Amino acid sequence: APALTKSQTDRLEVLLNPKDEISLNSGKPFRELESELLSRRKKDLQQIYAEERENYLGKLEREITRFFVDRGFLEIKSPILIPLEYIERMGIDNDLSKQIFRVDKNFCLRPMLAPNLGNYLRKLDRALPDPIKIFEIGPCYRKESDGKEHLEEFTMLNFCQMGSGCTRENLESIITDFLNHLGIDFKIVGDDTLDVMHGDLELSSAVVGPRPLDREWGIDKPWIGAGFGLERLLKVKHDFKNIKRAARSESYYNGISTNL
């Protein structure tokens, strides 16, 4: 029984699921271990195809949407491709900034939802009663400096409230109800600025305004907001070792390798 090589164990870890109950220094050749795990992963995909058929990331988006709509928040779908000026406007200059995917001279793939939400807040203040509550869920793009927990293409939820009720207590209560509903453990810290943590993993950054650069979006009321990464939430919900398993991918479906 030769020990598994490092590339072999890497291969097996692609096919490994958290609830497998299989330790890999146990006698059997690579080929049998591989063959066992393929068989199981095929079965996993067959079950999904026979019974559920929903993608985890689409499903989560829909669960989150239902949660915020039911709690009085308006669902936004704004452009993914935005003007660079909105980023400049957000404090940043062309010298953080090497993380943006530029598309054209004036355009980039949004790295955040906050700018478009700001515009929606300003415009809806003319139409809607206090408080104004809104959220968006969708793709954001950042070129990685880390990549251990970081994706270049990810999916954020960002919710906002403007006008009355915009306190820390209220912001914590929304966050708390929200993660309790999803069944994800968390603690709230701060880096008012708050961070919502699952062990060493950041689920969300959150803010209670006002912030000085509010006036750049025509915002002059109290507000509170928070952004969450859906793939981070999945990683924790499904106990994935690597966040790549939670992403838009051609290599994983609902965390199951597609290279079988």
Ligand X SMILES: Nc1ncnc2c1ncn2[C@@H]1O[C@@H](COP(=O)(O)OC(=O)[C@H](N)CCCCNC(=O)OC[C@H]2C[C@H]3C=C[C@@H]2C3)[C@H](O)[C@H]1O
Interface ranges with Mg ion (CB under 5 A): 205
Decide whether 37 or 56 has the Cβ nearer to ligand X.
56
State yes or no: residue 178 binds a second copy (CB under 8 A).
Answer: no
State yes or no: residue 207 binds a second copy (CB under 8 A).
Answer: no
What is d(CA 226, CA 205) in angstroms, rounded to the nearest whole number? 6
| Number of Cβ within a 10 Å radius of residue 196 | 24
What is d(CA 188, CA 55) in angstroms, rounded to the nearest whole number? 29
Pair 175, 206: CB distance under 8 Å: yes
Judged by CB under 8 A, the residue of 12, 36, 40, 65 near a second copy is 65
**DSSP one-letter string for 130-173:** SSEEEEEEEEEE---S--SS--SEEEEEEEEEESTT-SHHHHHH
State yes or no: residue 69 binds a second copy (CB under 8 A).
Answer: yes
Q: How far is the CB of 101 from a second copy (least distance, A)?
A: 5
State yes or no: residue 154 binds ligand X (CB under 6 A).
Answer: yes
State yes or no: residue 117 binds ligand X (CB under 6 A).
Answer: yes
State yes or no: residue 97 binds a second copy (CB under 8 A).
Answer: no
By CB under 8 A, how many residues form the interface with a second copy?
49
State yes or no: residue 86 binds ligand X (CB under 6 A).
Answer: no
**What is the identity of the amino acid at 250?**
E
Positive or negative, the Cα torsion across 215, 218, 221, 224? Answer: negative
User: Which residue's CB comes closest to ligand X?
Assistant: 225
| Number of Cβ within a 10 Å radius of residue 16 | 17
Which of 227, 17, 210 lies closest to 135 in space, CA to CA? Answer: 227
State yes or no: residue 246 binds ligand X (CB under 6 A).
Answer: no
Judged by CB under 6 A, the residue of 131, 228, 235, 245 near ligand X is 228
218: alpha, beta or left, given left = phi > 0 and alpha = psi -120 to 50? left
State yes or no: residue 16 binds ligand X (CB under 6 A).
Answer: no
Q: How far is the CB of 233 from ligand X (least distance, A)?
A: 8
Question: Which residues lie below 8 Å from residue 243, measured CB to CB, with a gap of 6+?
Answer: 149, 150, 151, 231, 232, 235
- Which residues are near a second copy by CB under 8 A? 41-42, 45-46, 48-49, 53-55, 57-58, 62, 65, 69, 72-81, 101-104, 109, 116, 119-120, 123-124, 126-129, 139, 141, 152-153, 248-250, 253, 258-260
- Which residues are near ligand X by CB under 6 A? 112, 114, 117-118, 121, 142, 150-151, 154, 156, 158, 160, 202-207, 214, 217, 219, 223, 225-229, 231-232
